[PDB]
Each structure stands twice: as structure tokens, then as C-alpha cells.
Amino acid sequence: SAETDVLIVGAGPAGAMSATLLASLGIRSLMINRWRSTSPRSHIINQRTMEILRDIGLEESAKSLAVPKEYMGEHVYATSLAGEEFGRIPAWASHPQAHAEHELASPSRYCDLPQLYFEPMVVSEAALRGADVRFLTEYLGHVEDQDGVTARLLDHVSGAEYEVRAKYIIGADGAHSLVAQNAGLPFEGQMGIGSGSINIEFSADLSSLCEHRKGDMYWMFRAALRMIRPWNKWICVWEEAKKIIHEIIGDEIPVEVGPISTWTINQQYAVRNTSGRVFCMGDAVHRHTPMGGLGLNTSVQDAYNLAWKLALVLKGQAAPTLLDSYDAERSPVAKQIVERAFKSLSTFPPVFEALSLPPAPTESEMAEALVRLKDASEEGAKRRAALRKAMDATIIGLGGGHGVELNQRYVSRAVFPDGTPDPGFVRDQEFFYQASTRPGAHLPHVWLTENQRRISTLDLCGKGRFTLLTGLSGAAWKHEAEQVSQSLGIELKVCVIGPGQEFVDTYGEYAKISEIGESGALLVRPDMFIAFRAKDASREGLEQLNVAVKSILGR
Amino acid sequence: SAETDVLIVGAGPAGAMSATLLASLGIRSLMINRWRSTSPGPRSHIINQRTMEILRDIGLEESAKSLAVPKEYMGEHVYATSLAGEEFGRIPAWASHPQAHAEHELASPSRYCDLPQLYFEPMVVSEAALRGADVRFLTEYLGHVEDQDGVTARLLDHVSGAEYEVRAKYIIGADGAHSLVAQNAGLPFEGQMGIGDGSINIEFSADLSSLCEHRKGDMYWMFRVGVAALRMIRPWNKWICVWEEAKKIIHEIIGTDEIPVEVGPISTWTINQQYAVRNTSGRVFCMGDAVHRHTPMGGLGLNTSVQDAYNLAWKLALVLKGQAAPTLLDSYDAERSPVAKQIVERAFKSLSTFPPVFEALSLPPAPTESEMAEALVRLKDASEEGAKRRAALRKAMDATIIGLGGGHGVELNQRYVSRAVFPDGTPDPGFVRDQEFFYQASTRPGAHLPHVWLTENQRRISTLDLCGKGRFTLLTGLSGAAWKHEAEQVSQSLGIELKVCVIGPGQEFVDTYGEYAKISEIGESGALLVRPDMFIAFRAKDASREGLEQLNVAVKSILGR
Amino acid sequence: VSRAVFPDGTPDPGFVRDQEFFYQASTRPGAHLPHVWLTENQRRISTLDLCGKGRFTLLTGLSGAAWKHEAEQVSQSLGIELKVCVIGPGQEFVDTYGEYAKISEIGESGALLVRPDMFIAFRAKDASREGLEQLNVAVKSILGR
């Protein structure tokens, strides 16, 4: 037997990130994993995940191993890699305007970094920061009571079974989570919808076909060809029958075949992610197709939302009520993600409609469509246009869904409403991010300066602590904040932004972006979400802070 | 209880590398470690070409390069009063001198780089597990017993609390400098562990780009203990000082209050010069710091530990698969124990290069702020006495370079002599130039395969890239096609893989520059048999039938059959 | 070899290695000034960067401060500009690597007179008065005066 604070079952990206964050806040975690190693899957890393690595100080590492945005831009649709292109779309915000909306949304950027490298990076940091990490250990089951939970583990090295006592359990096993099964969580959706896919990993120098048109992926109508390491290591998606490959490249280039695997099509999510003392996290509560990068990025953000709350509760600085906001804030996102990824598969058939093709067409029918495309008639013009309209529409699954990625709007006991009407979105909320400074939104990024050197507004804010932001007219918040930290037992950094100060807004972006006068203030959560906002530093505003905080923490 | 082929105790660079390589060759390893994680502490960071070659064989080179600081940022070693104070002078460290750099480029396709063991370790531990090794941290080796069929060790699990047994065919002791595995195996050591009356390592953080970016180096040494060092961990930003808020010893070393400083952990180093005279004791093989414990002068610790693992894995693999007799494992001691003694003696001897600096300034060791100040102004003196002092100091400073990148020979000039190299009946050449300072390429058996550039599809490839992959390789020119057939016969005959490359104009690999012709000391029809670990075990002048007959014998001999 | 180089009495060394394939730095008059790295403000500067600018330049170490005064006297005397660089630990221009010491075939107090076109016209072993007297002659001679 053994005792710890939190038991994390699973060391995929969500469990690992959970361990890292709990270790960074002084909480004892034991992380476990049935398998011998990290996953040998996902690869698009979006801005929200990069911001979190930036908060933890792992951003520079990930960028070192990741392929940059500049190499991810050209999505090509073709007959084969060596054959003729139907056309290209500007993927992963490579279009100048998409890129601008990208830059303004965050200090971080897209990059490609196979889960294969990501996982061990984070598992090793978690152990470095203080988490205990044991692989080849299988969760068999648990029982809860009023004071905590006891789980039974099976050790695949020693052979022994032993018990672990813990105050909480995080179910971060994968898409077949036994932890979710035992906690009794309800799911909606199915796990094999219809055709799945076959994933042939392989190696081959394709620089001559790719360096003049750099992209993350190359899709063929005849299946996908995705880059793992620039122009060199690859998967094909669809034993020496894997010269299906030669067909997809379109013999001349030598090829070593790696492992092959199978994917199914899923659309299932948990309606509720918590069940007294058990919290479930990543693929365990949202299982979906790969369309859009959303799986890994959502999983890490699940862990970022929960850690700080658990920490606070385990230290008596907050009431267990606070843990309910994990479900309120995070379950919607899971449903959203699952529905989005599936819906993104509908954007492909319309490509065949534009070529007048049935699905699974035959080499003849294809060949006809290709020459109709080259036709100098008005019928051929219509086709050309139809194909364009169709191809452009696929972009939602391929970098255009910026709104889905960033426009979280939490509503829970952990955000204190300011009395403002919910504004909607001016533009489409799946395609476009809308910065909001209203409570429940994520803190907008703008550039300030510290010592004439650019710093993001987000760099003022993480570090496992609440932060409160203001201008010079709002010095009063400094004193009001100290009083509240003293009164309730919690850290509360206060930044006064302006001309004299450490942080100044040399560009006026902070003034422009907040929807609020200089003397107003934003209370930012450890997870970077705004929990409270005041118009000004009036005494009515200043009295509210202390209440907002007691309320947020359940006290 | 549990069973596995090899039990590796320790997950420092040698144990981890061992696990990776054995997993890559299809061998079941369990690697264990007392601690909760990889080494956090300030330890090794200079990665030399031999270690980079090995990563290049394993395909981890591009990863390490991504996280490592390049050679170009490592060049300026400055000696000064303080970082903000006045420089006594600079030497061109880590082969930054144009000529040192040429000798570097020619010696290998790889390059120096700085990568804190802190990142190196987890890189390799995760690859080992990915390639098939079982890896368990928080597990302590308590002891073992051997017999005729293998070994049984007792382990203590610090998570579950349980003790259990592990049965294995062999054990690799890669715990550190206090190896309990070495103690139980009964290995003999020579040398001591605390030589005199050591060093304190203060980790800290602070943006020093204004003081360093115009003169990029790995280290900045201060004469002020007489001496203290300031080493870069992440370019201009994360640091250790070497020598609780008394750690503004630091402010003294930087020489200013103005730059804000966050203090990290502090630790202590001692001066060691101790190595094992013998690294093997029936069925137990000891590996890194466990058999060579020494000071940090020259980068040699980590690099030697990884190469210990590269020498052994393939041999263990062959033996465990019945392709080789247990005799082959004796060459680990023959080939590797000398290098341990060499490394330890070199690192310690590199500390003698410092006192002569004080002699050149007429200073006693541990001088006082006044005496120092006098020496500085004598140095600036427009007299002939002052000229002599200047020159003395130069002669002294230059001599320290052996510990700071000049020891290229120590790094690369291994010459194995063991049952695992088959002599060709060439006279031993010596070294034309100093064998500590200068690498000498040799193609004679027992030497490491030289690097030269060939082309595959008009693209440069190293001779070394034809050669690892856990297998023996045989190299030749077109006049030597006969070796192809002879090689097949021997692979069929004994049960082992044996790649053959015929280098030339028509072929896959060609030597577009003539470097292969120039470098081998051998005619086109001759051949080199290269080991998995990149060392030449056999060489033939030509492809005559007398030469061709020998191959089969050399191979049966090397493998003990 | 011409009236515009003042021989220092040193035998011509030859070339150790083939003179078509390999450069040999020399500091003997008639040769081109060798390059080595010095520092100005801890930033690398070439020895050649001390030296052009349409003017004669004279190079020395600290033990050679006497050349500063001697040089001024000669500029005043004949009507020409003559920069003087004293290379060393205190100064503008220091040889942080010791290359200057290593490369010149000359003690610290010695000096090299470099022509506008970067060729050495005069070299002195040291700053003795016999050496210092020569400068004025070397210069009159070089200019035909």
C-alpha cells in the first residue's frame, strides 16, 4: 500500500500535464500507465497549448523539436504526389489575413510536433518537478468513501498487486477508459460510425516533390500523405502490399516501410466528466476523429483547468464546490470538439460532387472528370468553380477553425459576472476568434514592454496564481488586493500597467483592447481566464472584489 | 519475482544508452533507478564527436542538435577579474581556432555541442522505453547472487514498498560514482576520492546577454579559493557559478548589483582520481562513473560513459543469441578499462594547468584583493618587466587549453587490443604528432573507422553512415567484388548479418572526392571489416585468395568460435 | 623589393612550404601585414583595420611607448600623418588572444611601419635609441628625401 494526494491514471498528454501542474503547485501526485512507454496520433499544436507550455517554461523546447508554421502552409489536393494537382488551399493560417488574425490572438504560434515527442517531454518534466511516475502499472479498480479513494493496482514488472490511498483520482486513460467506466459517467455518441482508415508509416526522401510547396499534408483523390519530419519521415493514411504507397506517391523513390495501424471513426463524448472524487480528462471524455488538431490541445487544456482548482481545495484555500466548475466549464468544450471533428468529414464528399463523381469512383470515371476539368467550354468553367468552392470549404478542418480553438466562454461559479450583457460574436464563431475581456473569456493578448523589450499580457499572468491588472489611475486596487490576500489566504499579484511602471503599454493596445477605463481592473485566474472585471476604481467597484473572490472559491 | 535478459542498474547516460542499444538489437532489458527522476543537478554538458556519431547511428543526432547549443556559441573562453571587469585574455576553446576546427571537421561528420545532461538523460531514457526496454524508477538495487546459469538480484520498490527478485542472464552496473553494484562484484580500484581540502555549484538565472553576446563562450573564468567559474546553461540566461542569500558571491563574480538574479539550487563537488582496474567480474559489467570517477576537466565523463555502453551492447546481444561465445565479453575489459584509466589521469592532470597562471602573475594561491590589484597593474606596466609578465601569462593561459577543447587526440585516438580485433600483419605505426592533442586517422585493426565523404545520389554521406545498425560491415572498391561472395558464404556459414559495400563509380556509394582511396592504407581490392561499434576488426591488402581465406578465420576468431 | 621598403637587415627567409599553393605570413619589410584578431571594446577587429586610410601606421606594444613620441617628432619634421597604435592590456586595441605577440617576429617594444597600401616598409627589433633613430631615416629614404 501507498498514500498520495492525487492518483493520475494515464500518461497521455492530459495526465502528464496534470502531473506537471500539480507538482509545480506543491501537490503530491502518483501518475501511472499500463504501457511500457509513451505512445509510439496527434501533431498539430495550437496556440492555447503553446501558451500553456509558455506558462510552464517548456515553450522554447517544444519549438526546438517542432516544425514551424512556415513549413505547414501548402495543403495540396492531387492525383498523386508526382501527378497533377487539382489545387491548393492555404492551411494552418498561411493566408496573410488568417496569419494576421493568428498573430493578434496570441504570442504563440501553430507548430507540428508529433505526440511521439510531446509526451516524453512532459512526462520527464512532471517527474523533475516532483511527481512520482510509474509505467507498467495497471489500474484494476477503486472504491470511494467520505475521506477519499482506494485503488487497486497491478504491477506488470514485479507481478504484485497493491493499494493506493488518495484524496482524488484523475481518469486520463484513453478512449477505453476503465476509470470512466467505474465512475459511471454517461456518454452520448457511437465509437465505430460506418470504413475506418489504415496508417502506414514509412520513410523516403521526397524533398524533390515537397520543398517547392511546403505543407504538413498532401491529399490524393484516387487517401492522405502527412509529413512527420520535413521531407523524410511520413505516414500514409488510406505487408509489402504497402506499395499502396507507391500508388499514393505515384517506383523511382526508395521506401522503407514502418509500422501500420488502424483508425476507426468516433463521435462520442461524456455528458458529465466528474463523479464524486473522480475526474476524467482527455480522450477518456472526448473521442473523435483527427480533423482539426483538437484532441491533444483540448486534453491539455482540460488539465490546465483542473490542476489549480484541485491544488486550492487540497490546501483548504477553497471549498470542494470549486471542483464542480471543471464540469461546467469543460464538458461543453468536449461535446463541441467531438461534433466539430466529425462534421469536418462532410467537407470531402462535396469535392466528388463538384467533379460529378460517385463516392469510391472507378479509374474511368475519374479520368473523365480530369479531362472535363481541362475543357474549354462553359460546362468546364462551372466545374472548375464548383471544385474551388468545394476545396475552400475543407479549410475548416485544416486551420480555418480558429474560433473553435480559442473562443471558450466559461459560465460557472468560478466566474463572477459583471452585469454586462453577453455580447455575441460579430463574425462566425467557429472560424473567427473574438477577443473578450468579459468574465468567463480568456485574457486577450497584447504586447506591452518591460525594459523596452516586448512582453505579452499573458506573461504577466500564470504561475499558479491569481493576477489583477490595471492602469495608473487604478493604484487603489493594489491596496485592496493586499487586504484580500491577507484576509483569505491566497497569493494575488497586482500589475499596474503604465508609463512609469515595470510593465508599460508602449503601443496603446492595452488601452484599446480592454473594454474598460484606465482605473478598471481584470482578475485573471491561474488558468488565464478572467473571473472578474470592474469598470473603474470607484469604492463600489473596490468593495465587490473581496466578494467576487470569496464567491469564486466557495467561501 | 521477474525474468529478463539484462538487468541495468542506473539510468544515467551509460545505463540508458545501454538500454536503448540492447532494445534496438532485440534483447530484453529491465533498467532501474533509485531516484524519482533523471539527474536534475548540474553535471556534464560537453558532447564530443564520438558521442554525436553514436546518436547519429541511433538516429537521435538531429534531436540532440535541436536542444543543444552549437559549437559557434562555445568558442570564447575568457579569463577575467569579473564578467563586468577587465579580461586577462581569451583562449580559443572547443576547437574555435580555425586550424583546430579543420582538424575537427576532418575527423568526423559530427560536431561539438553543449547539451546539459539534464536534457540528454530523458531524451535517451524515453527512446530506450520506445525501442522496447522496460524502465522502472524509484526501484533500489539491494544486492545479487550469481551462479552458473545467471544472476538473481533483490530490488526494493519505493512506491509500493515491496521487495522482489529479478532473474537475469547479465547485470550492468551503471549506478554512479558510489556504485553498490561495483562493491558487490568486488572490483579493484586505484586512486582516491577526495584529493585535497572541492567546489560549490550555485545555479542561477539572470539576463547577461549584454556581457556575453559580443563574445560568445561556454564558460567565463574569474581569478578573484583562487579560482571561480561561470558556465552558461542556456545562452545568456540560465547559469551556474562554481567557486542562502549569501549567494551574492555571484554578484562578486558577475561584478555588479545592477543585473537582477534568481538563485536556484546549490550543490557540492569534490576532486576525484579513481578508476577501476578491471570492469567485469563474472556476469557483472560496470560502466560509467561506476568505473571512472574524475574531475570535470575536458568533457570526458559523459562521453566516455556512452562509449562504454556502445562497446558492450552488441557483444552482449551476440552472446545472448548464441552467435558468439561468452569469450567475446572479455574484450569489454580489454578495450574499455584502459580508456577509464586514461580519462581519469587526464582530467586530474588538467588541474595542474591553473596554478602556473598565478605563478605568472606572482601570486600565492588564494591571494588577497590587494595582491591581485598589484598584479593587475604590473600587467599594464610599460616596462620590460611588464612585457615578461604579459608573455608568461600568455604561455600559462595557452597551456590550459588541453582541458578546454585542445585534447582531440584523447577524445578520438582509441586503439583497442583484444580478441575482438584481428591483426593484419602490419607494423604498428606510432603517432607522427602528439597523441593527446591530435587525432590520427588509422585504418589498422583496433582503430576507429575514419570518416570521409562519399556520395549516394550525388548527396554527401559519411563513410560512417554505411556502418552501424547493430551489424558488421565490410568495405571495398570495385576491384574487390570477390569479397561480396566471400562475405555471403561466411554469413551463411556462421549465423550473422554482414553488409557489404562496394564503393566506386558505378555503384550506390561512390567516392566522388577520392578521399576513400586516399585515406585507406590499402589498394582498391582490399577490405575493411567494421564492427557494430564502428571499430575496424580486420583489414586485407587486396582480394587475393590468401586474403579471402583469412576472413572466415578472422570472424570465427573474433566471435570465439 | 624597392626604394619604398627599408630593409631591416634580416636574411630573407624562404618558404617552408610551396609558395604557389601556400601563403606564408611575414612581418619582414616588403611583405604584406599579417592579419590577426585584436579586440577594441571586447569586439574583434583585425590588425588590418588599424592600418589603411591613406596614411602610414606604426604598430607596437606597451614596452614601446617611446615610438609615440618619436613618431610625432617625425610627422612634424617631414610633413606627413603617422598614426601610432600601442597594442596592449590597458589600451584601445588589445590582443586578447596573444596572436599579435605570436605572429610578429619581434619583441613587444619593437615596431612595424605599415604603408597606406598595407605593406610593411620598416621593422625594428625593439625600442632602443639605435632603433628609434632609424625611423626618421627609413621614412626620409622611403619618400626620397
Numbering used by the authors:
A (entry chain B): 4 to 43, 46 to 199, 201 to 228, 239 to 254, 268 to 279, 281 to 585
B (entry chain A): 4 to 200, 202 to 228, 236 to 254, 268 to 585
C (entry chain C): 441 to 585
Pull text from the paper.
Although lacking the FAD coenzyme, the apo structure of HbpA has proved useful in providing information on secondary structural elements and residues that are missing from the FAD-complex structure. In the apo form, the amino acid backbone was complete from residues Ser4 to Arg228, Ala239 to Trp254 and Glu268 to Arg565. In the apo structure, the backbone Cα atoms of Arg242 and Met243 on strand β15 in D2 closest to FAD, for example, each move 2.5 Å away from the binding site in a superimposition of the two structures. The relative shift in domains is coincident with an absence of some electron density in regions in the FAD complex compared to the apo structure. The reasons for the mobility of these loops on FAD binding are unclear; they correspond neither to substrate entry channels—as proposed, for example, for RdmE —nor to the region of the protein that would move as a result of FAD moving to the “out” position, as also observed in RdmE. The structural reorganisation upon FAD binding is also manifested in the orientation of the loop between residues 36 and 49 between β2 and β3, which moves to accommodate the isoalloxazine ring of FAD. In HbpA, helix α11 forms one side of a hydrophobic channel, the opening of which also includes the mobile loop 195–203, as revealed by the apo structure. The mobility in this region of the protein could mean that it serves as a gateway in HbpA for entry of the aromatic substrate.
This aromatic hydroxylation was later attributed to a class “A” FPMO, 2-hydroxybiphenyl 3-monooxygenase (HbpA), which was isolated and characterised. Mechanistic studies confirmed that HbpA shared many of the catalytic characteristics of class “A” FPMOs such as PHBH. The monomer of HbpA broadly resembles the class “A” FPMO aromatic hydroxylases PHHY, RebC and RdmE of established structure and consists of three domains: an FAD nucleotide binding domain (D1) containing residues 4–76, 96–197 and 295–374; a “middle” domain (D2), composed of residues 77–95, 375–427 and 198–294; and a C-terminal domain (D3) incorporating a thioredoxin-like fold formed from residues 428–585.
